[PDB]
């Protein structure tokens, strides 16, 4: 067994209606308030468009929910409604349905984001601190509301670098945390999957998102995106073990009594834990500080229970320059 160290009982202390998303009855707006303008590049199955809100002349984003089973539509809508107003959480404006096909669509605020592949190569030390701090605010918020995002990755963190705005998007994999519940491990992008997912440990919690955030921090400070670049899910764990070492991996499995897929016996090998300083080189030196490495070391831990919480991370000295300027 395992339990979240914080926010464990949030859903137990709310009404059944809060987390019982299968019972949620979405409230459909007028699809005719919105006029599609262009399809956005969001992924192989996505149908996401920029659109005009004809009622206020506002630019919006429309996400047509097609590939999904109905229970997951309710889950995403209910989660976005529960997080409405939250800090750095993408704002849901409306939920509409085609009258004829019945295909639902979610309408979101438009963020003028800079593609992460171009943005990450121009970030400075202070920019990374700032945007990581802003992302932590979103994660602390959703975790405090009893929700795990489960798909934190660069593509899901929209940054408008001119207005210094950040939004955590794509809540389609997010779920409510309940103590002792077993969750589907087929979540997250391969490169951002926590070790718990890779070894099929289902009793995970909000700390999954803190692994993913650590992966993003490492990628930014070391100019190595993604940080752990595996070729499949098995190799992904190897890539992690080549950095974190195998002894702590086997220690984690032993502690939680984790059933290890036997094909890992052949590929994991024996690896020492590498010191984080060893990933500094001439083209990332201006981004790396002892405070950054101290934080990263407390996020990228096998043992999900020993990772910092979002709030603990926000209190780390790495973020002092940001907190001071927010005063």
């Amino acid at each position: 067994g395992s339990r979240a160290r914080v926010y464990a009982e949030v859903n137990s202390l709310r009404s059944r209606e809060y987390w019982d998303y299968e019972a949620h009855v979405p409230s459909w707006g007028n699809q005719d308030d919105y006029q599609l303008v262009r399809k956005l590049g969001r992924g192989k199955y996505s149908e996401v468009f920029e659109a005009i809100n004809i009622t206020n002349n506002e630019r919006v984003v429309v996400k047509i929910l097609k590939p999904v089973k109905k229970k997951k539509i309710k889950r995403e809508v209910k989660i976005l409604e529960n997080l409405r107003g939250g800090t750095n959480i993408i704002k849901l404006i409306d939920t509409v349905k085609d009258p004829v096909s019945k295909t639902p669509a979610l309408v979101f605020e438009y963020i003028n984001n800079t593609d992460f592949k171009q943005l990450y190569q121009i970030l400075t030390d202070f920019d990374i601190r700032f945007y990581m701090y802003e992302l932590l605010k979103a994660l602390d918020y959703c975790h405090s509301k009893g929700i795990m995002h489960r798909d934190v990755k660069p593509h899901n963190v929209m940054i408008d670098h001119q207005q210094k705005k950040l939004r955590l998007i794509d809540w389609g994999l997010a779920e409510f945390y309940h103590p002792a519940q077993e969750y589907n491990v087929r979540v997250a992008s391969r490169y951002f999957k926590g070790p718990e997912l890779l070894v099929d440990y289902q009793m995970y919690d909000y700390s999954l998102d803190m692994w993913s955030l650590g992966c993003m921090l490492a990628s930014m400070i070391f100019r190595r995106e993604p940080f752990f670049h595996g070729q499949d899910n098995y190799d992904q764990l190897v890539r992690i073990a080549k950095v974190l070492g195998t002894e702590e991996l086997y220690g984690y499995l032993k502690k939680y009594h984790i059933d290890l897929d036997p094909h890992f016996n052949d590929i994991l090998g024996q690896h020492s834990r590498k010191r984080w300083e060893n990933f500094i080189h001439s083209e990332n030196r201006h981004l790396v500080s002892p405070e950054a490495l101290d934080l990263l070391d407390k996020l990228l831990r096998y043992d999900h229970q020993q990772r910092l919480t979002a709030k603990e991370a926000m209190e780390h000295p790495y973020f002092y320059p940001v907190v001071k300027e927010q005063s």
């Binding site: 007028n30 699809q31 308030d33 919105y34 006029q35 599609l36 659109a51 004809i54 429309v62």
Partner: peptide
């Protein structure tokens, strides 16, 4: 497409 086309 919502509002025509």
């Amino acid at each position: 497409a919502x509002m025509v086309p």
